[PDB]
Amino acid sequence: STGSATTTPIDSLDDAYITPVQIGTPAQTLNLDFDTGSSDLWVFSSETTASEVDGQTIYTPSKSTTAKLLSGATWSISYGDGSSSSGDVYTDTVSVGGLTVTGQAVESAKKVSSSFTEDSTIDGLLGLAFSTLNTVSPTQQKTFFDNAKASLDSPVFTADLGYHAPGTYNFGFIDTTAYTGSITYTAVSTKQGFWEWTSTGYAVGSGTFKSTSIDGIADTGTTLLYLPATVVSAYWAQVSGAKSSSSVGGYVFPCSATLPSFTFGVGSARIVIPGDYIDFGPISTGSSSCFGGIQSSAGIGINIFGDVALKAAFVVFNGATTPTLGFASK
Ligand SMILES: N=C(N)c1ccsc1
Ligand SMILES: N=C(N)c1ccsc1
């Protein structure tokens, strides 16, 4: 089997991407944020505290003939930005882009934190990291990909995120028309539950490539590119007037700037992030200070190749017995 679904930016900045997902019988379509940095499929629901729902589409398990309470199971998760959600669990039929999994754990939110409530565009998350990170207790549950894998033509999914445009998540096949050149594959460590890999270095603009190992995660659920302070300082030093602002919470730059590109290494291959991808616009409406899309990972504890990086590539998440990651230009 295979699946193919379009993923769409939630706003003009590509702050996140949403992908329609069919849950239950008859189908209830919710727009979920596919997150290769977590492993829970959770949704706004008929169980979500009413005051914490503001415009999201909800899953109502009582209206699904295939929903079953997973008795005793609870979940609770926090994300890198301090947001969180928790609740109980149903199993139900879940389809993405024509690919169907029966008996998928659908984690129904009883509580969500304010930043979820305040974002009406995201109806939940669909985790695509390794199932060892799944938070369901006392019986840990498998991700949609883990459940689908044995049925897929090939045990892979691909992320092809657009810059200010829709893109595609495919399951079970590699669309050879969706990228240019060849795909370069690189080793993955699953020891922390992430798609963790080591970049071979970087360049800023037209500068020389610096060969240096940068361990990090391929994370579709993080907006920005978070890298070591040394790397980030070298990038922003090439932008007149750029500075790190403790009050704003990262590097800002004059909105009048033209940003340089940023290149990262994948083995001997190179992925170029155009400068425009690194512009996250005014820090507040009407401001002439703009927020940078490359930020320091110092304090996070891990480097994160988030959407800023991934959208510059066609990315293969290879879930074979020994997982790997592939990157191609596009
Ligand atoms: N859920 C994620 N994408 C995440 C959380 C901490 S670091 C990455
Ligand atoms: N609402 C949030 N803070 C969020 C959205 C996707 S991951 C976290």
- Look at phi and psi of residue 223 and say left if phi exceeds 0, alpha if psi is from -120 to 50, else beta: alpha
How far apart are the CA of 151 and the centre of ligand 1, in A?
27
DSSP state of 274: -
What is the rounded CA–CA span in Å between residue 294 and residue 225? 5
- Contact at 8 Å (CB) between 198 and 280? no
> Which residue's CA lies nearest to atom 8 of ligand 1?
37
What is the rounded CA–CA span in Å between residue 216 and residue 36? 13
What is the rounded CA–CA span in Å between residue 80 and residue 316? 23
Q: Is 221 in the pocket of ligand 1 (CB under 6 A)?
A: yes
| SS3 state at 131 | helix
Q: Where are the beta strands (DSSP E) in 172-249?
A: 184-187, 196-204, 210-218, 225-227, 243-245
- Contact at 8 Å (CB) between 142 and 73? no
At position 159, the amino acid (one-letter code) is A
At position 221, the amino acid (one-letter code) is G
Provide the token pair at 273. Answer: 């992030």
Given the residues 35, 92, 119, 146, select the one marked as catalytic. 35
Residue 199 a catalytic site member = yes
Residue 247 a catalytic site member = no
**Which residues are within 8 A (CB) of 91 and not within 5 positions of it... i.e. 6 or more apart?**
67, 68, 70, 103, 104, 105, 106
DSSP state of 46: T
| SS3 state at 257 | coil
Which structural technique was applied?
X-ray
What is the rounded CA–CA span in Å between residue 93 and residue 108? 14
* Nearest C-alpha neighbor of 221 from the set 80, 75, 106: 80
The CATH 2.40.70.10 portion of the chain extends over 5-174, 175-330
What is the rounded CA–CA span in Å between residue 24 and residue 106? 10
Please give the class, per CATH, of domain 5-174.
mainly beta
**Which residues are within 8 A (CB) of 163 and not within 5 positions of it... i.e. 6 or more apart?**
14, 274, 276, 277, 311, 312
Question: Using alpha carbons only, what angle is made at residue 192 by residues 314 and 37, rounded to the nearest 5 degrees?
Answer: 40
State the residue for tokens 């992908």: 19
Does domain 175-330 correspond to CATH entry 3.30.565.10?
A: no
What is the rounded CA–CA span in Å between residue 110 and residue 290? 36
Q: Can you say whether the dihedral through the CA atoms of 268, 196, 225, 41 is positive or negative? A: positive
